[PDB]
Amino acid sequence: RTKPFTVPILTVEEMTNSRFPIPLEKLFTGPSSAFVVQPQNGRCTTDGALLGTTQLSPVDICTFRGDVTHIAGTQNYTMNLASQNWNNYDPTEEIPAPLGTPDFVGKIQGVLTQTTRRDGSTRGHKATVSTGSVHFTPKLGSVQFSTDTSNDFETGQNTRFTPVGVVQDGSTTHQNEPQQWVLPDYSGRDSHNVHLAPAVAPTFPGEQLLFFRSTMPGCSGYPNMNLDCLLPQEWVQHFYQESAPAQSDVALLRFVNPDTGRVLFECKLHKSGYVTVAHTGQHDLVIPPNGYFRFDSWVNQFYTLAPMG
Amino acid sequence: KPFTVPILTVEEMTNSRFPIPLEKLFTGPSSAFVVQPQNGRCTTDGALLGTTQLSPVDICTFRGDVTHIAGTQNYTMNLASQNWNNYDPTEEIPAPLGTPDFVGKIQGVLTQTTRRDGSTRGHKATVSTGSVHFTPKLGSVQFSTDTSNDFETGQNTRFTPVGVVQDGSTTHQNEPQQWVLPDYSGRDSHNVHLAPAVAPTFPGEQLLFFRSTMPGCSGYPNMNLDCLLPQEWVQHFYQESAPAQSDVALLRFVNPDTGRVLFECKLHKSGYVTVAHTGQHDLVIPPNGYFRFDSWVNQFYTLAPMG
Numbered sequence: 001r002t003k004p005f006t007v008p009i010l011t012v013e014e015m016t017n018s019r020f021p022i023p024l025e026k027l028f029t030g031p032s033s034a035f036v037v038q039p040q041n042g043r044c045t046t047d048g049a050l051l052g053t054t055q056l057s058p059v060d061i062c063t064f065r066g067d068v069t070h071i072a073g074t075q076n077y078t079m080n081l082a083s084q085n086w087n088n089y090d091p092t093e094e095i096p097a098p099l100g101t102p103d104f105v106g107k108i109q110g111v112l113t114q115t116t117r118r119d120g121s122t123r124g125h126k127a128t129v130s131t132g133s134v135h136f137t138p139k140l141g142s143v144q145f146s147t148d149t150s151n152d153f154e155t156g157q158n159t160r161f162t163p164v165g166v167v168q169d170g171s172t173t174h175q176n177e178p179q180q181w182v183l184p185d186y187s188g189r190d191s192h193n194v195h196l197a198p199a200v201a202p203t204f205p206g207e208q209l210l211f212f213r214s215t216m217p218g219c220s221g222y223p224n225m226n227l228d229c230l231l232p233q234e235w236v237q238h239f240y241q242e243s244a245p246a247q248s249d250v251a252l253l254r255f256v257n258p259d260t261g262r263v264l265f266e267c268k269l270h271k272s273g274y275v276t277v278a279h280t281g282q283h284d285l286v287i288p289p290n291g292y293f294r295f296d297s298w299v300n301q302f303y304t305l306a307p308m309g
Numbered sequence: 310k311p312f313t314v315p316i317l318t319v320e321e322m323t324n325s326r327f328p329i330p331l332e333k334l335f336t337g338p339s340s341a342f343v344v345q346p347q348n349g350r351c352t353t354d355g356a357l358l359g360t361t362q363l364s365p366v367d368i369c370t371f372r373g374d375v376t377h378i379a380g381t382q383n384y385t386m387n388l389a390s391q392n393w394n395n396y397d398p399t400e401e402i403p404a405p406l407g408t409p410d411f412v413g414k415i416q417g418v419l420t421q422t423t424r425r426d427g428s429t430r431g432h433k434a435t436v437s438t439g440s441v442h443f444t445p446k447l448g449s450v451q452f453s454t455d456t457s458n459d460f461e462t463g464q465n466t467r468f469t470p471v472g473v474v475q476d477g478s479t480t481h482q483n484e485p486q487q488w489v490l491p492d493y494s495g496r497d498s499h500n501v502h503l504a505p506a507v508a509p510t511f512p513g514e515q516l517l518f519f520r521s522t523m524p525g526c527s528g529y530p531n532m533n534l535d536c537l538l539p540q541e542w543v544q545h546f547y548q549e550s551a552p553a554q555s556d557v558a559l560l561r562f563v564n565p566d567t568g569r570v571l572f573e574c575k576l577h578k579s580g581y582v583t584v585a586h587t588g589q590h591d592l593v594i595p596p597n598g599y600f601r602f603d604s605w606v607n608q609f610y611t612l613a614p615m616g
């Protein structure tokens with residue numbers, strides 16, 4: 001027969017958020033018709049086709065590389081993006097934006113570091129990329145950082161953004177940003193995103209998406225730190241390696257507790273890459289820290305999940 | 310008491326999101342946008358939701374008194390309710406009943422009667438529902454006009470909606486945005502008491518939308534306007550108040566000339582319809598076709614595909 005499908009045998013705490021480089025913490029479900037679940041990172045079919053902007057490196061998510069150019073009389077820099085290899089980025093390539101680009105609207109704070117090539121001297125500065133900005137145009141090849149210096153970065157020098165966490169302005173409404181479910185305009189104002197991974201939704205009565213959730217570090221104020229992915233990064237990696245052909249619509253997984261030996265809940269892993277459970281309402285799953293998912297079988301869409309207690 | 314939908318053709322009915330007639334049925338996928346309109350929201354047993362009300366002519370209008378904002382051609386309107394009484398911002402509604410539920414530039418005519426002598430005026434006026442001054446829930450909206458002089462304070466003023474407008478210099482059909490709720494209480498405000506967002510929740514299903522074409526007044530506007538129930542359905546359900554026997558009412562869309570069934574659909578108790586189709590599709594329907602309620606069914610009834 002065909003190569004058997006599997007998911008990694010890893011606990012939730014053992015795995016990594018696929019939308020920002022931090023560990024998963026906890027599983028969450030809620031209704032999703034009041035927002036658009038259409039993230040671009042962490043997108044992979046069960047048989048291993050990466051969609052959207054999703055790539056394999058769990059550390060390259062939300063990072064940026066290239067050379068900078070100071071913007072006269074401000075503390076801001078434009079970065080001309082390079083690819084991961086440091087090869088020039090191609091804006092004609094059939095993707096929404098550079099792989100790893102952030103897929104939520106918000107202000108990401110991190111550190112911009114630079115090596116001068118002629119002598120190996122080295123600098124680093126606190127820097128913020130605002131993905132909702134008029135100047136956030138990764139698909140065009142340019143992005144802009146606000147920083148705390150006006151003189152120190154040099155032109156024509158390898159520069160890198162390391163993301164750290166998220167920010168919101170305290171004088172406004174608490175948790176008003178980031179908005180994890182609003183994609184940026186990858187090409188700036190008045191232009192359409194292209195080649196997106198499909199939006200997703202539960203398509204069976206009584207079902208909701210299962211999200212794998214982390215808390216982003218916050219750098220200032222009160223910023224909404226929940227960040228939900230559709231697949232752990234290790235799943236993307238796993239599926240990409242294994243490339244097992246989907247035998248039917250849904251892969252039925254059981255979440256098991258090894259201590260009791262008991263099945264805790266069952267979920268559907270849709271072929272095109274997300275998870276749904278049977279439940280109505282918002283719910284932080286309570287799980288044994290060493291519980292894990294295991295694959296049971298390929299079933300039809302119309303298979304009825306036992307309610308998640 | 311048996312449930313029913315009114316014996317009306319689509320062309321006989323009215324859009325419940327702007328005061329104009331229905332033209333057609335449209336279906337498509339809707340996971341890439343939030344389907345959460347606040348007008349034309351009613352349960353089958355006749356509970357009105359969101360900002361929905363009964364008058365098809367009072368959708369997208371405002372009433373109240375005006376104030377001029379010095380050195381502009383703009384006026385601020387303090388809203389009254391439909392009855393000309395004080396709008397109570399505490400009331401458990403997203404915004405005054407009949408407020409527009411999409412981000413857009415609506416163009417109309419602001420008109421005024423001076424009570425004491427019966428003199429009157431009309432001026433072209435536009436409301437921008439994504440403006441920072443669009444605060445209908447707070448009791449206050451703002452219009453832009455063609456006079457800096459004419460309107461008087463303390464008098465009864467009425468906005469009549471006429472069409473939507475869009476800025477031609479920008480990319481076409483970029484506005485209005487029918488599926489983005491306005492911020493009813495302004496910037497950094499949570500919408501409250503909203504009618505729930507809706508989605509198909511059955512494999513192979515898509516929402517069915519009752520569509521019109523709003524008139525355009527300028528620019529290259531997106532004139533599509535989709536509503537989940539026709540206003541006459543909302544009115545019918547309010548009257549009949551028929552209790553729901555299950556989760557889903559099965560309607561047949563029937564051609565009475567031939568008596569044949571064109572397609573079937575699910576009318577969910579909370580007030581929206583789905584059909585069994587994958588993809589965008591303009592429906593082709595005989596001009597005197599109408600909807601007929603056939604039975605209650607459970608959530609697992611499979612529809613015959615709509616061709």
Ligand SMILES: CC(=O)N[C@H]1[C@H](O[C@H]2[C@@H](O)[C@@H](CO)O[C@@H](O[C@H]3[C@H](O)[C@@H](O)[C@H](O)O[C@@H]3CO)[C@@H]2O)O[C@H](CO)[C@@H](O)[C@@H]1O[C@@H]1O[C@H](CO)[C@H](O)[C@H](O)[C@H]1O[C@@H]1O[C@@H](C)[C@@H](O)[C@@H](O)[C@@H]1O
Nearest residue numbers: 113114115116119120121122123124125149151152153154
């Ligand atoms: C601020 C800085 O860059 N300091 C580094 C220093 O740079 C000075 C030396 O090159 C100096 C020679 O001793 O030349 C100076 O330039 C002239 C000015 O142009 C002139 O107007 C004025 O009259 O005099 C000065 C010099 O006297 C340079 O500014 O070189 C030092 C040795 O490389 C190096 O140790 C020093 O590195 C900095 O140390 C400061 C403490 O002063 C802080 O630690 C900074 O973190 C650090 O700079 C950082 O590393 C350096 C190498 C570089 O990569 C920076 O981008 C980075 O921020």
Ligand SMILES: CC(=O)N[C@H]1[C@H](O[C@H]2[C@@H](O)[C@@H](CO)O[C@@H](O[C@H]3[C@H](O)[C@@H](O)[C@H](O)O[C@@H]3CO)[C@@H]2O)O[C@H](CO)[C@@H](O)[C@@H]1O[C@@H]1O[C@H](CO)[C@H](O)[C@H](O)[C@H]1O[C@@H]1O[C@@H](C)[C@@H](O)[C@@H](O)[C@@H]1O
Nearest residue numbers: 420421422423426427428429430431432456458459460461
């Ligand atoms: C423009 C207007 O209001 N016209 C109406 C006119 O108003 C003028 C008369 O009150 C006039 C007395 O005959 O007083 C004028 O005020 C002074 C100025 O203040 C002064 O600076 C200048 O030196 O001289 C003028 C007067 O000579 C008023 O402007 O009253 C007329 C009788 O009521 C009335 O027929 C007329 O109504 C307007 O008719 C114009 C034609 O000129 C158009 O049809 C307008 O549609 C119309 O005004 C409209 O109806 C009136 C009653 C009012 O409700 C307006 O708000 C509305 O636009």
Ligand SMILES: CC(=O)N[C@H]1[C@H](O[C@H]2[C@@H](O)[C@@H](CO)O[C@@H](O[C@H]3[C@H](O)[C@@H](O)[C@H](O)O[C@@H]3CO)[C@@H]2O)O[C@H](CO)[C@@H](O)[C@@H]1O[C@@H]1O[C@H](CO)[C@H](O)[C@H](O)[C@H]1O[C@@H]1O[C@@H](C)[C@@H](O)[C@@H](O)[C@@H]1O
Nearest residue numbers: 473474475476477478479480481482525526527528529530
């Ligand atoms: C008045 C008008 O039509 N304005 C619109 C403008 O019209 C010019 C363009 O279509 C242009 C495109 O090449 O062709 C021009 O015609 C030629 C002729 O040779 C001659 O007229 C002139 O000498 O040379 C020009 C150029 O070769 C048209 O006059 O097109 C704009 C671009 O789309 C458009 O934005 C503009 O629309 C108007 O915008 C202004 C903003 O200042 C106002 O909002 C107007 O209300 C708006 O017009 C209204 O909306 C537009 C979209 C349209 O529906 C109109 O019918 C309506 O009045």
